[PDB]
Amino acid sequence: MKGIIFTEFLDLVEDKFGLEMVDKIITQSELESEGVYTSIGTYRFSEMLQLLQNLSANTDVSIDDLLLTYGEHFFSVIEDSYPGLLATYKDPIEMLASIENHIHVEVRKIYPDAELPTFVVEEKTANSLTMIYKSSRAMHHFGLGLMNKTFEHFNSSAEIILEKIKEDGTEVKFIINKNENLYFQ
């Protein structure tokens, strides 16, 4: 895992739960880095899993909801760091169907040591998209938060249903349906 994921996450923990919680989940965790990360650094995901599990136990917020909130926050990091890559797309469904064969291809050029999930499109229309998410890190809700903000970026919204094919969240079917445009709301 790249260090930018660690630094932005602990920034969000400090922003939402306080600096003492940042020190707490770091103290409860070991952690070859010992809690010191750099943006271009490469660290084991087991470090992040410890940080998430300890934060969830301390705050009583599920890892699902913590990763969802973080995934939504990380879209703003994408907005401010790669606006040209984001400006390539004009439709949220087309962008999400382009994560595997374009977006994360560019990410591997940024970070050659990147450890990324796989997204496989099984069905796609103009307002629907079904993809299979596969990753040993089971960060489906991190991707869900990024998907939520992808639709928000294009002034849209979507119902996104997650079906865990493997119970540990390492294979998840995403059923994305752009919402009814309630034009008379």
- Residue 129 belongs to what H/E stretch? strand 128-134
The span from the CA of 119 to the CA of 185, in Å, is 34
Q: Which stretch binds ligand HEM (CB under 6 A): 11-19, 27-35, 57-65, 110-118?
A: 110-118
C-beta of 12 vs 86, nearer to ligand HEM: 86
Residue of the chain from 12, 17, 82, 170 that contacts ligand HEM (CB under 6 A): 82
Length of the chain (residues): 185
Q: Is 141 annotated as a binding residue?
A: no
**Which residues 6+ apart lie within 8 Å of 178 measured at CB?**
92, 93, 127, 128, 151, 156, 157, 158
Using the rule CB under 6 A, is 175 a contact of ligand HEM?
Answer: no
In this structure, how many other beta carbons lie within 10 angstroms of the beta carbon of residue 124? 15
Q: Which residue(s) pair with 161 in the sheet?
A: 175
Least distance from ligand HEM to the Cβ atom of residue 73, Å: 13
Q: Which stretch binds ligand HEM (CB under 6 A): 1-9, 20-28, 158-166, 177-185?
A: 1-9
Number of residues that bind ligand HEM (CB under 6 A): 24
Least distance from ligand HEM to the Cβ atom of residue 98, Å: 9
Using the rule CB under 6 A, is 64 a contact of ligand HEM?
Answer: no
Q: Is 135 annotated as a binding residue?
A: yes
133-166 b/e with 16+ CB inside 10 Å = b? bbbebbbbbbbbbbbbbbbebbeeebebebeeee
Using the rule CB under 6 A, is 86 a contact of ligand HEM?
Answer: yes
Strand 158-164 relative to strand 118-124, pairing = unpaired
Contact positions vs ligand HEM (CB under 6 A): 1-2, 5, 78, 82, 85-86, 99, 103-104, 107, 111, 114-117, 135, 137, 139, 142-143, 146-147, 150
Name the binding residues.
2, 104, 115, 133, 135, 137
